[PDB]
Ligand binder design. Sequence first.
Ligand SMILES: c1cnc(Oc2ccc([C@@H]3CCNN3)cc2)nc1
Ligand SMILES: c1cnc(Oc2ccc([C@@H]3CCNN3)cc2)nc1
Ligand SMILES: [Cl-]
Ligand SMILES: [Cl-]
Ligand SMILES: [Cl-]
Ligand SMILES: [Cl-]
Ligand SMILES: [Mn+2]
Length: 340
Amino acid sequence: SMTSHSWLCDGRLLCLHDPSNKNNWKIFRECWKQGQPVLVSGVHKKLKSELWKPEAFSQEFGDQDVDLVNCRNCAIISDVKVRDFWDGFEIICKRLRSEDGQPMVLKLKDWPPGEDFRDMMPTRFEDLMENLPLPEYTKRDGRLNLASRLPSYFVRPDLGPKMYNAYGLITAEDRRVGTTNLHLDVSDAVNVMVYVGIPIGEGAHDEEVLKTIDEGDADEVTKERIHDHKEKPGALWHIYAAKDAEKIRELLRKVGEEQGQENPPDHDPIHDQSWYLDQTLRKRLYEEYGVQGWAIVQFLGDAVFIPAGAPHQVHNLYSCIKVAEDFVSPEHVKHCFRLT
Ligand SMILES: c1cnc(Oc2ccc([C@@H]3CCNN3)cc2)nc1
Ligand SMILES: c1cnc(Oc2ccc([C@@H]3CCNN3)cc2)nc1
Ligand SMILES: [Cl-]
Ligand SMILES: [Cl-]
Ligand SMILES: [Cl-]
Ligand SMILES: [Cl-]
Ligand SMILES: [Mn+2]
């Protein structure tokens, strides 16, 4: 039967089921005020599916010049055409290969560039902004979005949205690599999974995705979403409470020193965006510092709400197109104030 909401993460994560129900705020508000992330399912059913396909981005925008990142070693592939990324998104035989001959795992960097999404893609911009959940919080002029209403004593977010495009990590060695490394934002954000590409035939890798889920931190009900095989899984997130950010910096300073990095005692390993917490590091964080996080699998059409100040990292299971909007809720405005 259809219901308003359910729980994941053993009751610690709210999952809203109807992205457009006008009463969602009544359930959302208390979880948000406590500094928890929230998940909203079903946003893909509200969107124009033909606007969000890899082949359409390649046809319309393929002659633009871009840089790519090699996820495995952080090497920059400079000044290539954006079609060279899009045409290998799902079809592994058409995908760029390393010198050694393996298909690469690539991220498309800063595309569309800066604040240019609205100008470059006006029909995509309208389809996303009109269908965002919790619209009093997430729309540019929502009543509970302070972004347009604050003075210069507050860091204000850039005009959005921002698109995040990257291939899935493939091998057992790739399990310890991030798509986006551990970092935090001083604004709130909503991140929507608009497309998942699952390769078939030549370079399929379904067995290592299921291993990664079965051997990892995820709760039994999320494992009972993977195994049902009704919905496409896109990306594995880990999110930590804003109150635990300094304990995480203490662990990463200790691990940087153990690995022979030579860092001043004040340096900020979260701002550096250089670390991915693998299973070994997540267990050390729990046992040595007493810090627990939220392990979240973002499926097609899931919207992840990330509280301001919360450290987070992302690991793509399959090839993903994500679209994110920043906002400034009253609950978390302290995180962007420039004094004390
Ligand atoms: C048609 C429509 N909806 C259902 O189930 C629901 C869905 C959403 C809710 C909301 C969400 C916020 N407050 N209650 C309650 C019941 N079933 C058939
Ligand atoms: C409706 C029905 N079926 C689909 O296809 C898929 C394809 C792959 C999965 C993954 C694989 C790993 N765990 N589940 C799930 C659903 N899509 C929409
Ligand atoms: Cl467009
Ligand atoms: Cl709302
Ligand atoms: Cl990164
Ligand atoms: Cl907070
Ligand atoms: Mn982020």
